[PDB]
Design a binder for this molecule. Structure first.
Ligand code: HEM
Lengths: 101, 54, 439, 55, 49, 414
């Protein structure tokens, strides 16, 4: 059940890879206009932290240099901060479609 | 708005064939450019059929 | 409560026909005011080449002398009764009306009658008002909007008396006479062609016999040719102004069709936008939504103006020269979208906007009685609001797409451009964008 | 009379293109027969269909 | 500036059936459009054939 | 329709003013005394921002739904404001007043003010201020109120040139928190019944300033326009007084906008004095504002560049020679008739009559029918006329002028 689902999720989060490049959930999202709108609706300091994480990750994949043990981003200390933003983007796009049709 | 002003090919076609500001003065002496172009592709076509039988 | 509940208790506006060719109309209800006005079917359409602008001249000179009072005491009477006065003259009609209170109705009728029929003229007053009208033409250089509409009329009615200007040209301002003006007033504003309307805290009997006492005794006893639309292009290249005004119109039907009702639905769908509105990217009007989304203009009104059984079904948009073409193209796209793919909820919203805007247009007493006078001139009658709502419900999407098929689709418009209008496409681009081969 | 034809077959551009294609094959038929009749009329005699009919 | 405008006339250039400011033109548009579109359609027939 | 209004002041604090008639134009007004006189020095321009914030998402009713439903039922929504008052006016028919009322309640009392929308609204503030102050006369009025008070009646309808792009929505949240009581709200209904409004306002909200000091001086705005626009105003009186009615009668004596289009205004003494003196194009008018603590009164001139001071001197000495006890009782009766005509004929149209009824019901919190207001017009005599004129002539001064200023007297040289 749920006590084993967390084990599967932590195995997948170890084997995903972006925990080793110092990244998080909201660092790998593929974009349309909607996700870039969600990026646009962010606070300033969170957006600064996101662009610095992105630029470090691109540098360390430029010389192909995985971070040491000290800064592998642990599972369940990461923020799912884009969940309200992206969720309201979902609701607004579905509101547009289902109201105009 | 429109494909013609936001598409990277129709930008070029719009700036070459459609929104090109032409002078409102030119006589039939200026027709020979497009006639050279059409003769050029017609020579390409007839020569290519010749090349299929040569 | 329904439209039967709102339209079962509704004002009625009883009319009568006084025995000199006079008409009278009364909007009788419980409001503590009166709007008492004279609507006469006279304008620049009926005028001639030498009498061009004489009517505008009259509505300037209608207050500088009567045979019973001088000018200062006349308007001093208007002041001392504690009232308000207004007049204007379009290309077709002319209204002299009084916003007064009910306890000065008879004195209002009396002084209004002397205003209408027995003006007195001066050489001093013709000279002073000639200077005033010359300076106000030089001031109507500034109001770009009516300059655009006068360009529109002058290019869409080329050769007719309808394309005569509202006020007359400057030589034809500075050359006229008293004899021509008396001949003008004696031909136009006299016996058959006048509707006395009044709206408010009034009755029919005292009002009736007061009009019989003061307006009768006249008994006067050959104009209005049919017109011709052309469709053409006029442009006023002036590359210093910060904004461009571009309008374009097709030949609308006029007053005497249900096509008028259908096009009021369509120009309730598109209609108005100004760039000071609240809520920009979530607009209901799709043309306005795109026009905010890419700043494709500043403002527009898409509408219809009816002269006597002819129409200028028009659009007028103000923009910058950087994006003339884009607004032009999306305008033609929205016309063709009405022409072919008229859906349902847009027709329903158009009917709802027509209902609410016509109701709020029927507010107060002065706009309502203005509607009364303008209805009893053209239609011969005032249309009840239940008849308006019935003709609203008597149109669905089928009539809308047929009317857009008749009037918009593949016709010959008239274009008036003013300002930074070099990046306006030429007239053949407008025409080859007017019809779809589905582009 | 031209306005009646404009009212019939010049408004919807799909049916417009289809009816000028119909007129195009109409013109194919009439034009080939016109060209054949004219060219045989200016070469009455010296054409192979005459000599072959006599063979 | 605008009220002192008379639009110059094209009496030489118009069709001889719409040379009347009395005459209305709701119906006479279809004859003209049929004539021009007749020319365009017949040209298109020649081109496509 | 002989039936009349119904006043119901619910004692949690709000005012329901219903009027059931068989009329089409169902108008709902929500009036709150929350104008520009409730800001402080730190958040100038916030009221303008809230006035353009009538199209933003709420908790549950997003702005897309708001705009699409409101313009889909056809009913139109406007928001106006004076320096005391904000007004939310929704017009429709009797079709869907309940869902439009629910949208109105959500717009008032569910503030979110999301941040990207705030930035787009900053740009909208710059647009709106340009379209407002392309009329110079509103800028003359704004410098005038800047010239008379050190306090809450010195602020702007609009936003200054630096807070544009710099005002945060947390100021809006806290301002709505500490300035929207139930004890100030006026629900004014034309078309819908009293019990439905009673149910709505009883069950649907249930949540919960600074006076004026005279300042004096002048403000000169050198602008180079060939139009000297000059206002000269002294403080007059509060609102709701027979003194203020006497100022109203006095300005109907002195001259207002013309009753007659293209007239001469012969009873207007100020135009008569400048007409006797000056032979040029010009215009002279009176001016009176009045609010729940104080008010302003004076005159207001529009004149040529080299013909400013003569206009100023002629109108000021005309006010003086009327204030020296030298008047006409036919002009007193004429001003009483003109004031009766003005109040009785600013109340025809349903928008203006709605605004007037709601503001007269909310302003001192008590409705007054027009007939006893006509009686109070009939009650004020020439004693307070000459008293208020003597107070204005022998009182302090405030001046606001803009345009070219080649020959403009300051205070002394009137
Ligand atoms: C790229 C496309 C072309 C191909 C594939 C092509 C091919 C040929 C071939 C196979 C021949 C020999 C057939 C013959 O001579 O009758 C030929 C002849 C010739 N081509 Fe082209 N050709 C091409 C374009 C052109 C162009 C653009 C020109 C210049 C206008 C040109 C000028 C000639 C001339 C003058 C001859 C001589 C004709 C003769 O003497 O019989 N060709 N070409």
């Amino acid at each position: 059940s749920s006590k084993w689902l967390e084990g599967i999720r932590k195995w997948y989060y170890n084997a995903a890879g972006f925990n080793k490049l110092g990244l998080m959930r909201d660092d790998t999202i593929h974009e349309n206009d909607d996700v870039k709108e969600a990026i646009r609706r962010l606070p300033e300091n969170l957006y600064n932290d996101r662009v610095f994480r992105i630029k470090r990750a691109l540098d360390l994949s430029m010389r192909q240099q995985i971070l040491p043990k000290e800064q592998w981003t642990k599972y369940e200390e990461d923020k799912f901060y884009l969940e309200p933003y992206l969720k309201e983007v979902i609701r607004e796009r579905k509101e547009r479609e289902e109201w105009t049709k | 708005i429109n494909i013609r002003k936001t598409h990277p090919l129709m930008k070029i076609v719009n700036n070459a064939f459609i929104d090109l500001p032409a002078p409102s003065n030119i006589s039939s002496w200026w027709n020979f450019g497009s006639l050279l172009g059409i003769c050029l592709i017609l020579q390409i076509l007839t020569g290519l059929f010749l090349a299929m039988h040569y | 409560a329904t439209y039967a509940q709102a339209l079962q208790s509704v004002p009625e506006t009883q009319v009568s026909q006084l025995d000199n060719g006079l008409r009278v109309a009364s909007e009788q209800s419980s409001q503590p005011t009166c709007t008492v006005g004279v609507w006469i079917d006279a304008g620049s359409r009926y005028e001639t080449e030498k009498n061009n602008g004489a009517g505008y001249f009259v509505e300037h000179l209608a207050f500088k002398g009567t045979k019973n009072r001088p000018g200062n005491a006349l308007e001093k009477e208007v002041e001392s009764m504690g009232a308000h006065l207004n007049a204007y003259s379009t290309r077709e009609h002319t209204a002299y009306y009084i916003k007064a209170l009910s306890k000065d109705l008879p004195k209002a009728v009396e002084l209004l009658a002397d205003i209408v029929q027995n003006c007195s003229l001066e050489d001093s007053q013709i000279e002073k008002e000639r200077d005033v009208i010359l300076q106000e033409l030089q001031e109507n250089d500034t109001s770009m909007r009516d300059v655009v509409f006068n360009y529109l009329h002058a290019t869409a009615f080329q050769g007719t008396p309808l394309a005569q200007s509202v006020e007359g040209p400057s030589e034809n301002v500075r050359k006229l006479s008293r004899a021509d003006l008396t001949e003008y007033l004696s031909r136009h504003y006299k016996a058959p062609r006048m509707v006395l309307a009044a709206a408010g805290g009034l009755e029919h009997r005292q009002l009736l016999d007061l009009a019989q006492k003061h307006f009768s005794g006249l008994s006067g006893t050959p104009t209005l040719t049919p017109c011709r639309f052309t469709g053409s292009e006029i442009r006023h290249r002036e590359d210093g102004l910060p904004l461009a005004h571009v309008a374009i119109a097709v030949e609308g039907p006029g007053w005497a069709n249900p096509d008028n009702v259908a096009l009021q639905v369509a120009n309730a769908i598109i209609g108005h936008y100004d760039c000071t509105y609240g809520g920009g990217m979530h607009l209901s009007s799709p043309l306005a939504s795109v026009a905010v989304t890419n700043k494709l203009c500043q403002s527009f009104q898409t509408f219809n103006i009816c002269y006597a059984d002819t129409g200028l079904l028009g659009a007028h948009f103000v923009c910058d020269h950087m994006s003339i073409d884009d607004m032009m193209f999306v305008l033609q796209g929205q016309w063709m979208r009405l022409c072919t793919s008229a859906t349902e909820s847009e027709v329903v919203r158009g009917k709802n906007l027509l209902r609410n805007a016509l109701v709020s247009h029927l507010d107060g007493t002065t706009p309502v009685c203005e509607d009364i006078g303008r209805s009893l001139l053209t239609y011969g009658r005032r249309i009840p609001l239940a008849e308006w709502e019935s003709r609203i419900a008597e149109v669905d999407a089928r009539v809308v797409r047929e009317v857009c098929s008749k009037y918009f689709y593949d016709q010959c418009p008239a274009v008036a451009g003013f300002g930074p209008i070099e990046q306006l496409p030429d007239y053949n681009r407008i025409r080859s964008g007017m019809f779809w081969l589905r582009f | 009379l031209t306005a009646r034809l404009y009212s019939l077959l010049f408004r919807r551009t799909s049916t417009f293109a289809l009816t000028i294609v119909v007129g195009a094959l109409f013109f194919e038929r009439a034009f080939d027969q016109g060209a054949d009749a004219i060219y045989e009329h200016i070469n009455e005699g010296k054409l192979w269909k005459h000599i072959k009919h006599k063979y | 500036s605008h009220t002192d405008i008379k639009v110059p006339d094209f009496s030489d250039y118009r069709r001889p059936e719409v040379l009347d400011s009395t005459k209305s033109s709701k119906e006479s548009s279809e004859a003209r459009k049929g004539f021009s579109y007749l020319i365009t359609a017949t040209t298109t027939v020649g081109v496509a054939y | 329709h002989p039936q009349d209004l119904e006043f119901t002041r619910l004692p949690n604090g709000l005012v329901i003013a219903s009027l059931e008639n068989y009329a089409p134009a169902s108008r709902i007004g929500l009036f709150i005394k929350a104008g520009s006189r409730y800001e402080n020095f730190n958040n100038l321009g916030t009221s303008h921002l809230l006035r353009l914030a009538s199209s933003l998402t709420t908790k549950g009713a997003s702005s897309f739904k708001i705009t699409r439903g409101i313009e889909a039922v056809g009913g139109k929504l406007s928001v106006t404001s004076t320096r005391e008052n904000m007004a939310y006016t929704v017009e429709c028919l009797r079709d869907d007043v309940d869902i439009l009322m629910e949208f109105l309640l959500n717009v008032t009392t569910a503030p979110e003010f999301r941040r990207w929308e705030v930035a787009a609204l900053q740009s909208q503030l710059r647009i709106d201020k340009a379209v407002a102050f392309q009329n110079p006369q509103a800028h003359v009025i704004e410098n005038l109120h800047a010239a008379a008070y050190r306090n809450a009646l010195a602020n702007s309808l609009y936003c200054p040139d630096y807070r544009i792009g710099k005002v945060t929505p947390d100021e809006l949240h806290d301002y709505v928190q500490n300035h929207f009581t139930s004890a100030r709200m006026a629900l004014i209904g034309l078309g819908v019944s009293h019990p439905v409004l009673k149910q709505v306002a009883e069950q649907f909200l249930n949540i919960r300033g600074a006076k004026a000091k005279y300042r004096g001086g002048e403000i000169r705005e050198q602008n180079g326009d060939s139009l000297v626009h000059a206002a000269l105003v002294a403080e007059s009186a509060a609102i709701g007084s027979a003194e203020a009615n006497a100022f109203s009668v006095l300005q109907h004596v002195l001259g207002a906008g013309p009753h007659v289009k293209r007239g001469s205004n012969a009873t207007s003494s100020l135009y008569q004095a400048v007409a006797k003196g000056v032979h040029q194009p010009f215009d002279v008018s009176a001016f009176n504002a009045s609010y729940s603590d104080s008010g302003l009164f004076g005159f207001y001139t529009i004149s040529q560049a080299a013909s400013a001071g003569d206009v100023i001197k002629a109108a000021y000495n005309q006010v003086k020679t009327i204030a020296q006890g030298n008047l006409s009782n036919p002009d007193v009766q004429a001003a009483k008739n003109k004031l009766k005509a003005g109040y009785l004929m600013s109340v025809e149209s349903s928008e203006g009559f709605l605004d007037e009824v709601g503001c007269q019901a909310l302003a001192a919190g008590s409705y007054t029918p027009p007939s006893t207001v006509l009686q109070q017009i009939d009650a004020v005599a020439d004693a307070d006329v000459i008293n208020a004129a003597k107070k204005f002539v022998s009182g302090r001064k405030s001046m606001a002028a803009s345009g070219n200023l080649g020959h403009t007297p300051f205070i002394d040289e009137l």
